[PDB]
Design a protein around this ligand. Structure first.
Ligand SMILES: [Mg+2]
Ligand SMILES: [Mg+2]
Ligand SMILES: [Mg+2]
Ligand SMILES: [Mg+2]
Ligand SMILES: [N+]
Ligand SMILES: [N+]
Ligand SMILES: [Zn+2]
Ligand SMILES: [Zn+2]
Lengths: 163, 365, 365, 163
DNA sequence: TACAAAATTCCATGACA
DNA sequence: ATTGTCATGGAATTTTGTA
DNA sequence: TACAAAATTCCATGACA
DNA sequence: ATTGTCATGGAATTTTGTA
């Protein structure tokens, strides 16, 4: 029954390793399954601890009912598992090598990789400072389905930085 | 000269008949219910009033009671009040005996991200090397982000805000005139982004009430969570942030989180009332909830308040007054009345200051 | 157990009929105007209320709005209020929302030298090596003596007072509980002389209002006399003393000097009204002037004041509260109500403290 | 006409030199002509400057219309003269070697000398600390004329230290 | 068409600077 | 040139369950 | 047995801690 | 065991000088 809502499901994945920017190498990527809203956190490794430090920041603003990811070692560890049980998050794994996430999220996760590469060339090492700009761009991009931007679906208003 | 006429029994405007006026010791005297008093020549009166006032720099009645011991003349307080208005010392040292008009209750911002209020709390007891907290409150929703810093600096603010505005960019940020926000580095950071900077009138934290009021809650919550324990606040900030953002305002019947997102996250005791509404239905229930929220009105004026008038003489309060030195600046003119509680003055001397009336007193006399 | 009865349609005191109560997911549920809510077993309710309250240590309504998201049961706030009254942290950290009763206006002492009020002002900017002022005010007359000291010490006080009491000896000296007056050396100095020592309740300078109020005037006068100039206050003390003692109180229509001596000295603008009365006639005009002086009455109580009742739980305010630590002491009982504004408590734990109600809050719930 | 009043006339004189107490040697003696009230100030010399420092203390509580004294060098100096003109005090001198002051003041000035000697023997060097005690004694002593004490005539009440 | 008690709302009070 | 805010808990008012 | 203006009183406001 | 105080200057009220 229940129609899809924000905070229902956060899809997380790692992008990296990238050329070192401010001594960081990876980007944890969180996308909200219903809105397409996207948070990006720069980490030093694709490790449980990096994931937890990053997710601690996000989850102090909103906690998802479900985190979905691939069977990356960082997400399947029992530290990460005990972390999510503490916050009453259910963990959901896509089967190995058959990584499914909803249609909208795939298209988003695609935009990101490209959006990154397009500006992670020319300036391959200054990408840390650009994360805020990248994130806004993503979150204020029209979905051809809905023609609401993730920002609009999340906050229910227009944004002061349209694209 | 003008005293000559009197003893000769002729009338003068001011000096009542029925009292006999006589000469003794080369001074002119008068018999009065009170007693026998000297009437000084008009050319002496300013000096006399000055001597009386100068003994202790007394106000009207106390100055008058001295003078009345020895002298009488028509309209003594009129002359008394003239000195008081010219006593530089009494003017810059005396307290006001008139309250500011009623506070304004500025409209709630229409939507989230319209206006951010920001302030630093601290110094706090060192935690993990950190001493201060950057507190950012969305005007509309009350939603608050907390960042721990090592100093209340521009660079710290910029670092913290680049993280925040990586989620949304505000139209306006309001702060007090603390060093960290009035730096030109901060201005440029804001101009880069189309953010407008809006500062409170100097030394008036009521103007930042949204955040200051929020600082109270943060500190109160930290306090409770730290009873018994050593003050390790650094680890608690995230917890506090979350806890506060998901706390109900008894008068609104909503949490800041609710006002920002229109649905609860996966937190304890999450509200489910809209489980069957589609996001869209929900989001317009939200647009309706936001516009209908309680708004307070301004209180009655107190019996003895004053409001600022263009051209009136006022005095700005001395901010950090040294020991044994005047609490007030010299008189200045109101140039513009921005609202009944905020004013522009031509000061010391002379630059335009935008100033809160709470930091003003009207010059008396 | 007690929930079993309900789904079977039988009535229970508290649970209204007309709402249908059903089973789902092994939990008992109820359909309500608000929505569908879970009714927990009574053995779970304390824990639930605790979890809600603990998220941010919220008060009644804010705690209730959480719980109401998921649960319903008879008399929820009754249970909410029970936790709030047992939350050690909320009790010692929350502000009071109830004012003290109206201040008392203790009788003016009947005659000069009946009661001295004394306090130190300072530190002031060094003058001739001096930093503090001993201020002594006669309760009845307002007459004030000023002594400059290098520290606010017992020895300084004793040196100064041996000079003063070389003119008259007071029945009572009232001071705050500052180190200089609570020393046993001071007690002995007083007992040597038949002077009674009377101290104000701790951290409550209103109780020494006669002197504190006089400190204002001294400082204000020094300030004016020092405008422009370097702060050389040491030479001005005598001048200030004299000036103030011969200043009229607009409401009394007398100077302290007048109230003490019943005639003016040879000072500027000296009053001559009694030039023809013999000292004796004058001195009984004085006895009449002293007894007839204006006495203020206590103000109306504010809408929401509290007064202390023997056996009531109250909390003493924490004097010098460290950063991020509770502003209140744990609960204590009122043992005696000395007057409606002063109280004896059995404290921490347990000694008798005599305490001002302004430094108390009643324990809520 | 005018009946005699407090502050009408202060008679001042020096007693000394005495054995050194706290390195002081003289006592300036001020007696109010109408009440018989007595202030005592310990000085290091019978000099204008000592007199002025002492009298500065007294005159910050009440100023006499007239100070009367003998033609002691300290009182006849022009510093002391300029001092009194500043405070609008008139100076009055008794002729030399014929030192007249009212009957009541002579009797008082006598009591003092004796009162001093009676306690400035046995303990000839501890007299500084005793000045407060001496002063009270004097000021709460019944005048056989009036049978009011100086304290009573000055303040118009009974004192808390009667004698 | 009215009751007592529970639920809700009102709002002074104080604390953030 | 800009502007007070709002959690708290007794008391006051209004709603509720039952008649 | 009445008026306008001066004189006096009232009293909120803020500052001493 | 102890307790608010009072100068200040506009406004409100009362007194005054003249009729
Ligand atoms: Mg991966
Ligand atoms: Mg600040
Ligand atoms: Mg003190
Ligand atoms: Mg001699
Ligand atoms: N506004
Ligand atoms: N009393
Ligand atoms: Zn002045
Ligand atoms: Zn609590």
């Amino acid at each position: 029954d229940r129609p899809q809502k924000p905070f229902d499901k956060f899809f997380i994945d790692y992008i990296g390793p990238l050329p070192p920017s401010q001594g960081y190498l990876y980007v944890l990527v969180v996308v909200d399954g219903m809105t397409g809203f996207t948070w990006l956190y720069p980490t030093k490794a694709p490790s449980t601890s990096a994931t937890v430090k990053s997710l601690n920041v996000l989850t102090s603003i909103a906690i998802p009912k479900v985190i979905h990811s691939d069977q990356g070692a960082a997400f399947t560890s029992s530290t990460f598992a005990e972390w999510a049980k503490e916050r009453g998050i259910h963990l959901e794994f896509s089967t190995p090598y058959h990584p499914q996430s909803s249609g909208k999220v795939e298209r988003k996760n695609s935009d990101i990789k490209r959006l990154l590469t397009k500006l992670l060339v020319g300036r391959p090492t200054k990408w840390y400072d650009l994360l805020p700009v990248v994130q806004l761009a993503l979150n204020n991009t029209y979905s051809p389905v809905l023609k609401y931007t993730p920002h609009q679906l999340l906050f229910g208003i227009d944004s002061n930085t349209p694209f | 000269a003008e005293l000559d006429q009197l003893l000769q029994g002729h009338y003068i405007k001011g000096y009542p008949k029925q009292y006999t006026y006589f000469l003794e010791d080369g001074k002119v005297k008068v018999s009065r219910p009170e007693g026998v008093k000297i009437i000084p020549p008009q050319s002496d009166r300013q000096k006399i009033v000055l001597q009386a006032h100068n003994l202790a720099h007394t106000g009207r009645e106390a100055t008058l009671l001295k003078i009345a011991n020895l002298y009488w003349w028509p309209n003594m307080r009129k002359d008394v009040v003239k000195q008081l208005g010219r006593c530089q010392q009494c003017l810059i040292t005396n307290a006001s005996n008139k309250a500011s008009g009623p506070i304004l209750r500025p409209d709630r911002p229409q939507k989230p991200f319209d206006k951010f209020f920001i302030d630093y709390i601290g110094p706090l007891p060192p935690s993990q090397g950190y001493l201060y907290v950057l507190v950012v409150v969305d005007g509309m929703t009350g939603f608050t982000w907390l960042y721990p810093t090592k100093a209340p600096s521009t660079s710290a603010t910029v670092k913290s805000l680049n993280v925040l505005t990586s989620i949304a960019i505000p139209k306006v940020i309001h702060s007090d005139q603390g060093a960290a926000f009035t730096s030109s580095t901060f201005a440029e950071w804001a101009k880069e982004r189309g953010i407008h900077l809006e500062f409170s009138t100097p030394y008036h934290p009521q103007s930042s009430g949204k955040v200051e009021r929020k600082n109270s809650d943060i500190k109160r919550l930290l306090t409770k969570l730290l009873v018994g324990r050593p003050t390790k606040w650094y680890d608690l900030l995230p917890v506090v942030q979350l806890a506060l953002n998901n706390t109900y305002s008894p008068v609104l019947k909503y949490t800041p989180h609710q006002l920002l997102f229109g649905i609860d996250s996966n937190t304890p005791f999450a509200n489910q009332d809209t489980l069957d509404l589609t996001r869209e239905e929900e989001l317009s229930l939200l647009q309706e909830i936001r516009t209908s929220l309680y708004h307070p009105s301004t209180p009655p004026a107190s019996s003895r308040s004053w409001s600022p008038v263009v051209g009136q003489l006022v005095q700005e309060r001395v901010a950090r007054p040294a020991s044994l030195r005047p609490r007030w600046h010299k008189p200045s003119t109101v140039l513009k009345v921005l609202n009944p509680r905020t004013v522009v003055i031509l000061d010391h001397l002379g630059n335009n200051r935008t100033v809160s009336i709470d930091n003003l007193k009207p010059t008396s006399h």
